[PDB]
Write an enzyme that holds these catalytic residues in place. Sequence first.
Site, mmCIF file in Angstrom:
data_model
loop_
_atom_site.group_PDB
_atom_site.id
_atom_site.type_symbol
_atom_site.label_atom_id
_atom_site.label_comp_id
_atom_site.label_asym_id
_atom_site.label_seq_id
_atom_site.Cartn_x
_atom_site.Cartn_y
_atom_site.Cartn_z
ATOM 1 N N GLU A 109 1.925 -9.256 -22.555
ATOM 2 C CA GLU A 109 0.949 -8.621 -23.429
ATOM 3 C C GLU A 109 0.253 -7.444 -22.759
ATOM 4 O O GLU A 109 -0.361 -6.633 -23.455
ATOM 5 C CB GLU A 109 -0.080 -9.641 -23.910
ATOM 6 C CG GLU A 109 0.535 -10.782 -24.678
ATOM 7 C CD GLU A 109 -0.468 -11.666 -25.389
ATOM 8 O OE1 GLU A 109 -1.683 -11.441 -25.238
ATOM 9 O OE2 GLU A 109 -0.032 -12.584 -26.115
ATOM 10 N N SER A 160 0.841 -1.180 0.000
ATOM 11 C CA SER A 160 0.000 0.000 0.000
ATOM 12 C C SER A 160 0.878 1.232 0.000
ATOM 13 O O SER A 160 1.988 1.224 0.530
ATOM 14 C CB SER A 160 -0.908 0.057 1.212
ATOM 15 O OG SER A 160 -0.143 0.201 2.390
HETATM 16 N N1 LIG Z 1 -7.591 -3.209 1.827
HETATM 17 C C1 LIG Z 1 -6.796 -3.264 2.907
HETATM 18 N N2 LIG Z 1 -6.178 -2.133 3.273
HETATM 19 C C2 LIG Z 1 -5.368 -2.116 4.336
HETATM 20 C C3 LIG Z 1 -5.162 -3.334 5.094
HETATM 21 N N3 LIG Z 1 -4.326 -3.035 6.086
HETATM 22 C C4 LIG Z 1 -4.021 -1.734 5.972
HETATM 23 N N4 LIG Z 1 -4.653 -1.196 4.934
HETATM 24 C C5 LIG Z 1 -4.542 0.188 4.472
HETATM 25 O O1 LIG Z 1 -3.162 0.458 4.321
HETATM 26 C C6 LIG Z 1 -2.865 1.747 4.813
HETATM 27 C C7 LIG Z 1 -1.945 1.616 6.016
HETATM 28 O O2 LIG Z 1 -0.772 0.914 5.651
HETATM 29 P P1 LIG Z 1 -0.348 -0.441 6.350
HETATM 30 O O3 LIG Z 1 -0.129 -1.466 5.308
HETATM 31 O O4 LIG Z 1 -1.252 -0.710 7.477
HETATM 32 O O5 LIG Z 1 1.089 0.015 6.885
HETATM 33 P P2 LIG Z 1 2.430 -0.835 6.874
HETATM 34 O O6 LIG Z 1 2.782 -1.142 5.473
HETATM 35 O O7 LIG Z 1 2.353 -1.962 7.812
HETATM 36 O O8 LIG Z 1 3.531 0.219 7.380
HETATM 37 P P3 LIG Z 1 3.913 0.640 8.887
HETATM 38 O O9 LIG Z 1 2.883 0.063 9.767
HETATM 39 O O10 LIG Z 1 3.838 2.076 8.749
HETATM 40 O O11 LIG Z 1 5.277 0.112 9.099
HETATM 41 C C8 LIG Z 1 -4.192 2.393 5.157
HETATM 42 O O12 LIG Z 1 -4.624 3.139 4.022
HETATM 43 C C9 LIG Z 1 -5.091 1.213 5.437
HETATM 44 O O13 LIG Z 1 -6.479 1.414 5.225
HETATM 45 C C10 LIG Z 1 -5.874 -4.532 4.632
HETATM 46 O O14 LIG Z 1 -5.743 -5.600 5.226
HETATM 47 N N5 LIG Z 1 -6.650 -4.419 3.562
#
Ligand SMILES: Nc1nc2c(ncn2[C@@H]2O[C@H](COP(=O)(O)OP(=O)(O)OP(=O)(O)O)[C@@H](O)[C@H]2O)c(=O)[nH]1
Lengths: 368, 429, 441
Positions: free
Chosen positions: C254, C140
Amino acid sequence: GNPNWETAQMIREYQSTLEFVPLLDGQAVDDHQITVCVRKRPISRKEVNRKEIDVISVPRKDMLIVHEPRSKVDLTKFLENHKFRFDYAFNDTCDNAMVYKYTAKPLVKTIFEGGMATCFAYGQTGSGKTHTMGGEFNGKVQDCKNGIYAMAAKDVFVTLNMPRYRAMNLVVSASFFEIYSGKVFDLLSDKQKLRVLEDGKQQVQVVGLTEKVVDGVEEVLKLIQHGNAARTSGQTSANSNSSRSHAVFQIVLRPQGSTKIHGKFSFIDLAGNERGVDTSSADRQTRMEGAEINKSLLALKECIRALGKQSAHLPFRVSKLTQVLRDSFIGEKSKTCMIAMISPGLSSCEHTLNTLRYADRVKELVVK
Amino acid sequence: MREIVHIQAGQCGNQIGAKFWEVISDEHGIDPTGSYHGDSDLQLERINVYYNEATGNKYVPRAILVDLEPGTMDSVRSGPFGQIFRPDNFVFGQSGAGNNWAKGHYTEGAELVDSVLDVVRKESESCDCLQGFQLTHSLGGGTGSGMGTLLISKIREEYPDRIMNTFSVMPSPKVSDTVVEPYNATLSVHQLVENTDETYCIDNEALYDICFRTLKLTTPTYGDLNHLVSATMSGVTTCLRFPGQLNADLRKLAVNMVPFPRLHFFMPGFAPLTSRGSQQYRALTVPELTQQMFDSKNMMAACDPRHGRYLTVAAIFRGRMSMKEVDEQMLNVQNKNSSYFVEWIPNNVKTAVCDIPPRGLKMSATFIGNSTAIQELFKRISEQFTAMFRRKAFLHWYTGEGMDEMEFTEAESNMNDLVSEYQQYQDAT
Amino acid sequence: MRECISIHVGQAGVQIGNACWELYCLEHGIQPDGQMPSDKTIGGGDDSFNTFFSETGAGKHVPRAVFVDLEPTVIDEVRTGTYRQLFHPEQLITGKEDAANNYARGHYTIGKEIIDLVLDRIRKLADQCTGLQGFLVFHSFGGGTGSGFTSLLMERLSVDYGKKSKLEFSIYPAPQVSTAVVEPYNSILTTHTTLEHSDCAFMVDNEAIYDICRRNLDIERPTYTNLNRLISQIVSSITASLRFDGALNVDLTEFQTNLVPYPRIHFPLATYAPVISAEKAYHEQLSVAEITNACFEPANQMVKCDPRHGKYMACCLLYRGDVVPKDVNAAIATIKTKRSIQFVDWCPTGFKVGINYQPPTVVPGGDLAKVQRAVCMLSNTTAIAEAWARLDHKFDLMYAKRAFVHWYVGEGMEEGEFSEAREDMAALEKDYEEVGVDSVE
Ligand SMILES: Nc1nc2c(ncn2[C@@H]2O[C@H](COP(=O)(O)OP(=O)(O)OP(=O)(O)O)[C@@H](O)[C@H]2O)c(=O)[nH]1
Ligand SMILES: CC(=O)O[C@H]1C(=O)[C@@]2(C)[C@H]([C@H](OC(=O)c3ccccc3)[C@]3(O)C[C@H](OC(=O)[C@H](O)[C@@H](NC(=O)c4ccccc4)c4ccccc4)C(C)=C1C3(C)C)[C@]1(OC(C)=O)CO[C@@H]1C[C@@H]2O
Ligand SMILES: Nc1nc2c(ncn2[C@@H]2O[C@H](COP(=O)(O)OP(=O)(O)O)[C@@H](O)[C@H]2O)c(=O)[nH]1
Ligand SMILES: [Mg+2]
């Protein structure tokens, strides 16, 4: 013939596009309570043996333009027009004497008018700091004859020997600092951590500071031989050395029966993380002191922009480099100077733009 | 995994701390003898955080107790959980501070800090990796104000890169249980600006208010004010200990929650707080927890939050939830309260959702918020201070222990700069 | 045999990896302990295809997956859950502290010294495969490890592998709802290496899938379990032609030829046709002309982004199940007639149809059910530029105030990194203003 000639081909075409009106020595000086100095060093001898492209164009006395090899979305090369406004935009043809018009500075006149002033020295490695303050333009032994710290020592000491100023019976005192990670040391004794307190009369004094009433011009320059004795502070790197702490070399104007000071004059060695942070080095001491340098440098950028853009929440106690120098900024008849060294090379174009936008936070719009 | 050391200074500190390790124990299912007799296997994965192991299946908290000047010694030992702390940790001296700062920081603190830090280093190297140094102390007092901020001058010195949270009980505008109290707050906030990453401003009046205006308790004793503080203390480190759906360390909070390095004085809330037997006339849902968290009568710092703009806030949700009702309830509050927040920040509220509730509840929360309304907690003291200091009122009990008058003016200059860097962002622009 | 290497990064990447590998094990027949007792009844077929599954001699199957998050709390759910014994026991945890939501801890501080375990594990995994490669990265924007550590993982995999296709499936910060206050800082610093190294960046969003889970699926309280299955249905039909037998298969190479006009406009804004309920699995025909017209209305885009305020450049209709190739061209000449579905002059061809004919399967436990066909349209429109200007504005509003930045420069990173990431996004937004405007003569 040369492989990289094409990027430089548009650079040779841009230098006929606008009007070159550069800076010549002997022009008038306006007030400019906060000045921003930017100096370009000349092309060295190693660079022409390496195929080096000059990318630092200096078209004005208040404007400096940097080009960058980029591409369009059709893989078509062009030059980005980074447009910066300085006060004080200097050429690479500038000798130190033209810089003596603007850095052997009229703020030493402000020292003698009952006011206080300071000066900064920011830059990267291989940019001209070795020829300005901490060692000067001299060669195998960088002794103080040719640069700023020697010539400003003649503006402080010799000028007050004029009888208008000699009748005031004013003397000279020096004091060296070492600003570590929240620590304000002394270079006279390395094991003396001095606490930063403040009297009731709103004057921030480093508690228990030792001075020496010294000397003529030839001996006051040899004080840095005692100043750089400790090699502050414990370098362990490749291109040894680069100071992690900061040096504040204060020269104080006072009479003899005093107990009364006005005209504090200080020099700052803004030496930081020029090389990238060796995070592959698992030494925990490196990150603990390499971090607090950058947050101290962010303090000095943030503090001055609130001085130009004036307000009533003036940031001081974010670190201790600003806290010690708190009195010299907020004087009524006070002014501030700040110098930025610039590296000409294309291989250091990324490290050059970081130094340029660091000296940009006084909000100068390019009217053109 | 990530491990925390808990330090307890001042007599207010271990009294919160003795209730603190009872909330932590029942959250992990651990008896007075440290024997694990929990319900599930999900609460053994991070015993490592608070409870290091012992020889036969027993668990010991990493709790240093600086504050056991012997009037409090044989009550904490002769308490509910006096048979759980390691007895070498009970570090103290004789002739306690006397509600004096200089007898905490300069005279009796200097002859005790060597015996504390010889146990701090023996609890650091029994750990894989530390991040947390929780200090439960209180301003106003003696040990908790001079000796509590002598260790932070030393522990941050020997550990410049640890998250240092100090759950600092603060003085009150009316409840004055100490006559010297505007001295022990000015001299200790001067230490807690420089030397902490976060510090939680808790008052007794807003804890006296909740036990009357919300919980409807007849006689709220001192246990029932600490039972509310400790429900926040186990609410910041919930995502450390338990799995979730959006985790938050003690550092993802203290990177988001703090704009500038001096602006880290927090006010903690908690929800659901309500008064019942087993018949209560409500429904625990995600919009039900939200209105109570942001309500001005469920803070703990005893300032009016609608007097100032929230800089940024953090809502550490627990229990089983739905993330759409989490991200949309946190949106509608920010739009209805567009002046009550700072306009020039994109989104102010962050969210943290764990997956394990408390024992009895179904859902809970914790409102940790950084506001400019805490300018009132620092303006009142700085008016009470300069009233006492102008006459040089109580100073001969402090300058007779080694201090100087030029440290008092240093401490009031630092607190008056926080009010300057809070009045600015409270104004609009 | 053609194959992919699925590298999940962050908590967002691992949480999606809970359900992407839950879907693959159910299509092919693989139980949560590696075996295949479904095809043992028939006695033939290699259906645990070597695109996603290494096979050992004892009948067990091992995925191509590695994931790094710098925090044990996320992966200890995988190491104790139902999929404990399935994966190889090198699920790289080793983080003594979380990133704490910044790019500087991150690309520099603790991402370094853990990356040495990462690249060597990929080399121990890539050298077991003959043929096509493709790095399915999952992270993300906005987070700490999903933004910082991926940025270190791209510049260290664009050197040891060169020109291999990298499909990275990023969750983008929503313009209205943000779960962090420092998320506008991380999602502008991660663009400087997404633009350079990763050849194709699938952006999805959380708010635009919240409305899909409320309007179409009719779920009033959608948790993160029910959002990651909809991304999992998308990721399946992106890499479905590498596995199953279709009438027009579309390889991962592709995509690069078709979806990407210029080397820096690779952001193609996936969709789907999730109008299953499954009460509304009746009451509705769901033909080829029906599911192709689901991309018309901007209430079914996976990004909070209005395609009617921008051109299209190139689309990629990818079907599943009982699709007859005749019915497709009826549902395409229709779309080229509608005057708000607007193209550029310089792409008169438009579309590209990949008809796989394996139907999408149903994860038991909700929330949709057995439809007979589907579509995952992938179309880089000009409209994604207004989705970035609502994020550069969040960056610029707290860059004048010098907020949050002492935790970025006090962790090794220089403060000049921010304006270097602004001069990309100002110039990258400038690229979308030129491409959509046609030239006149
Ligand atoms: N769709 C979805 N989005 C997620 C999930 N977990 C976190 N997010 C989204 O990801 C963003 C937060 O990033 P995370 O992935 O939680 O952070 P991280 O990569 O662990 O990074 P740090 O915790 O900062 O070390 C937010 O926009 C959340 O809504 C998930 O399981 N599914
Ligand atoms: C039948 C029923 O549901 O009873 C509830 C209850 O009635 C209420 C009123 C409880 C009750 O709490 C109080 O009355 C209270 C007393 C002193 C200080 C603070 C609160 C309860 O006592 C408290 C108790 O809390 C817990 O069990 C939590 O796990 C809690 N535990 C403790 O504080 C604790 C108490 C004694 C010994 C060990 C632990 C907790 C909260 C946060 C973090 C860790 C633990 C609960 C839900 C209830 C009763 C039992 C009536 C409430 O409090 C809590 C902390 O949940 C008060 O408002 C809430 C709402 C609850 O519904
Ligand atoms: N919440 C709470 N506050 C306390 C407790 N004991 C004392 N206080 C408060 O702490 C302050 C007095 O300091 P105290 O800790 O007793 O002094 P010390 O032993 O010198 O640190 C006052 O504001 C009291 O109201 C307690 O057990 N709980
Ligand atoms: Mg995380």
